[PDB]
Amino acid sequence: PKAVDPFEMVRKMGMGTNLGNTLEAPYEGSWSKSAMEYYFDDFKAAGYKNVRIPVRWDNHTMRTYPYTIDKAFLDRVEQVVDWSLSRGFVTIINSHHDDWIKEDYNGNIERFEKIWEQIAERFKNKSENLLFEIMNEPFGNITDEQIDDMNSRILKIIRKTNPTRIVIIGGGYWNSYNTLVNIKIPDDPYLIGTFHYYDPYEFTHKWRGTWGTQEDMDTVVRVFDFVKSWSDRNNIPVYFGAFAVMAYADRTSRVKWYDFISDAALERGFACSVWDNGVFGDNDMAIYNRDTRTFDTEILNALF
Numbered sequence: 181p182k183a184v185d186p187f188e189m190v191r192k193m194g195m196g197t198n199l200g201n202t203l204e205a206p207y208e209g210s211w212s213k214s215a216m217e218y219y220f221d222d223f224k225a226a227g228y229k230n231v232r233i234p235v236r237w238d239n240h241t242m243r244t245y246p247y248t249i250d251k252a253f254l255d256r257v258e259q260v261v262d263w264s265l266s267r268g269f270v271t272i273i274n275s276h277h278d279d280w281i282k283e284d285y286n287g288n289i290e291r292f293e294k295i296w297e298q299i300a301e302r303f304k305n306k307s308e309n310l311l312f313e314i315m316n317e318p319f320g321n322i323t324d325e326q327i328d329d330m331n332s333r334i335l336k337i338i339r340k341t342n343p344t345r346i347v348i349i350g351g352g353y354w355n356s357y358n359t360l361v362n363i364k365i366p367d368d369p370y371l372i373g374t375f376h377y378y379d380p381y382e383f384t385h386k387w388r389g390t391w392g393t394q395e396d397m398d399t400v401v402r403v404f405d406f407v408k409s410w411s412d413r414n415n416i417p418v419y420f421g422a423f424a425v426m427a428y429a430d431r432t433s434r435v436k437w438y439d440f441i442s443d444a445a446l447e448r449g450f451a452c453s454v455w456d457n458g459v460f461g462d463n464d465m466a467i468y469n470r471d472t473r474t475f476d477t478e479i480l481n482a483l484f
């Protein structure tokens with residue numbers, strides 16, 4: 181009845197990191213290096229206060245009823261979660277890249293439910309610091325009615341075994357042109373809303389040449405301020421699961437951007453996780469080198 185409320189958590193979560201391109205890859209390791217328990221020792225030393233762990237269940241779950249999840253895979257995900265929880269991190273697991281659910285919905289919603297049914301069961305006794313994020317990026321390729329349907333039913337499933345565990349549902353998205361927020365939010369006291377950058381017409385834009393300008397900053401504060409009003413009006417805390425997910429004009433801009441987002445976000449009381457590709461050598465968007473156990477100091481400095 182009296183558990184931690186979403187606002188207390190968001191305050192607790194603070195600035196964190198993503199364990200990108202790992203368990204959300206088709207198969208763990210097929211992309212960036214697999215999860216090692218030292219990753220978390222370093223993140224803790226680094227300052228991160230939360231760790232989002234994307235997870236694609238597609239290939240560890242039967243494609244046919246009863247859509248059971250590999251016993252082993254579940255064991256694996258729990259091992260990683262426990263490493264994170266043991267270190268005091270507010271930990272977030274979800275469904276990432278399980279696009280099949282958007283290529284149909286009437287057809288795959290049950291498989292999606294079974295998966296969430298089994299996740300909720302296995303982690304039901306986990307610490308309050310383990311949050312369930314229904315789906316990474318709900319928007320796009322699916323009607324609003326279906327996005328709403330999905331949240332209600334997965335939440336309902338989760339609540340049967342996790343009566344007070346905080347759940348994260350998309351509250352909306354933003355892009356250079358507009359911001360979209362949800363009006364219809366489920367009637368539940370344990371929900372956090374999450375936003376990500378999304379542009380349905382992305383594969384059309386005549387483009388610009390990546391981010392970093394003053395105009396972009398002006399654009400984000402705009403977005404952040406509206407989400408803020410949304411947050412206050414709906415009484416639902418905000419969390420930017422993966423930011424700085426863009427390419428930049430140069431090293432100096434990139435650092436500045438990481439410094440900027442963190443400031444604006446936390447000042448408005450938002451929780452957020454930086455997107456960490458876990459890739460160096462391309463070099464993309466990785467802050468922590470899983471091979472050298474070293475971080476891009478300048479960026480960490482800009483985040484804290």
Ligand SMILES: OC[C@H]1O[C@@H](O[C@H]2[C@H](O)[C@@H](O)[C@H](O)O[C@@H]2CO)[C@H](O)[C@@H](O)[C@@H]1O
Nearest residue numbers: 200201316317376377422425455457464
């Ligand atoms: O889809 C494969 C592609 O994913 C990239 O990460 C995404 C992340 O999955 C998404 O949730 C977030 O909103 O954006 C990031 C980056 O765009 C990953 O960085 C790529 O290497 C990978 O090929």
